[PDB]
Amino acid sequence: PQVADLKAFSKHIYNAYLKNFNMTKKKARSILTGKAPFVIHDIETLWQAEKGLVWKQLVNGLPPYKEISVHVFYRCQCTTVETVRELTEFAKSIPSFSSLFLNDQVTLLKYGVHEAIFAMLASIVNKDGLLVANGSGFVTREFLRSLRKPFSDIIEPKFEFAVKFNALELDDSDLALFIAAIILCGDRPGLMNVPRVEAIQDTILRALEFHLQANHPDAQYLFPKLLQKMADLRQLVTEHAQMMQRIKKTETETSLHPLLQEIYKDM
């Protein structure tokens, strides 16, 4: 009965995921393996791509131009905000989330979206770079390394996490549950109805446990491995937030999007 009810639960969350995210891991890995994106690996190809690739965010809508490293940061920032939007619609497509009072919904999103973003980011990452512009471009890890501090520093740790997370070989059906577990997290500060969020979280984690038994029958220790990845993401986001505070302090000409400011306001 428990195993049965949780199967239906997991399907409803997978459907919310397919409905709301712009790219699946299945799509992204098929592009990344060739089963072609324009490669951005230096200033000239960055320029050609801004001339020749279709970006969700028209380049004129980015903040005013400053320099190459900041331009790259602005595109990272636009994508981050776009993914907050998708995560919000994903969360709202989950009935037990939509039943929480709107203020707790905000609290969960505030402290959860970056963790979820960096987990999902892995889907479009390999050891050599990552997909951009809805898969029509590929930016190399080496080029991102070449940007000036503090912008190269805030990027490289995400690759390190991603290459390790991708070795677990989750598919989209696993990720939908994993992400749901990250957002529906009863530990976040200032939650109003904690026992309710704890109850939902535990349901998701039991559903995820059974899902991996069925979907990855020969993978050992995969559930506890993923719990530890949830702990790892928390530390990745702590470090991210600290790097953002230094960018705010030392790079005063760099615009920071007000929604992300609201997230960092008191972490």
Residue 94 in contact with ligand B7G, rule: CB under 6 A: no
User: Should residue 170 be labelled a site residue for ligand 7U1 when binding is judged by CB under 6 A?
Assistant: no
Closer by beta carbon to ligand B7G, 89 or else 169: 89
Q: Taking a C-beta distance cutoff of 8 angstroms, is the pair 37, 31 a contact?
A: yes
Which of 102, 189, 195, 221 contacts ligand B7G by CB under 6 A? 102
Contact 9, 207 (CB under 8 A): yes
Minimum distance of ligand 7U1 from residue 181's CB (angstroms): 19
Main-chain phi, psi angles of 57, to 5 degrees: -100, 105
- Nearest CB to ligand B7G, comparing residues 70 and 113: 113
Position closest to ligand 7U1 via CB: 76
Partner in contact with 107, chosen from ligand 7U1, ligand B7G, none, beta carbon below 5 to 8 Å by kind: ligand B7G
Give yes or no for residue 207 binding ligand 7U1 (CB under 6 A). Answer: no
Decide which of ligand 7U1, ligand B7G, none touches 83; Cβ closer than 5 to 8 Å per partner kind. Answer: ligand 7U1
CA distance 173 to 7: 11
Pick between residue 216 and residue 257 the one whose CB is nearest to ligand 7U1.
Answer: 257
| Most distant CA atoms of the chain, gap in Å | 59
Structure tokens at 116: 């979820």
Return the one option of ligand 7U1, ligand B7G, none that residue 109 interacts with (CB less than 5 to 8 A, by type): ligand B7G
Using the minimum distance from each CB to ligand 7U1, give the nearer residue, 79 or 201.
79
Smallest distance from the beta carbon of 114 to ligand 7U1, in angstroms?
Answer: 6
Nearer to ligand B7G, 72 or 113 (CB): 113
Binding of ligand B7G by 263 (CB under 6 A)? yes
Beta bridge partners of 126: 129
For position 107 contacting ligand B7G by CB under 6 A, the verdict is yes
Q: Which is nearer to ligand B7G, 107 or 126 (CB)?
A: 107
The verdict on 180 binding ligand 7U1 (CB under 6 A) reads no
- The answer to whether 127 contacts ligand B7G (rule: CB under 6 A) is no
Rank residues 145 and 213 by Cβ distance to ligand 7U1 and give the closer one: 145
Residues that bind ligand 7U1 (CB under 6 A): 40, 46, 72-73, 75-77, 79-80, 83, 117, 121, 130, 132, 139, 154-155, 158, 244, 260
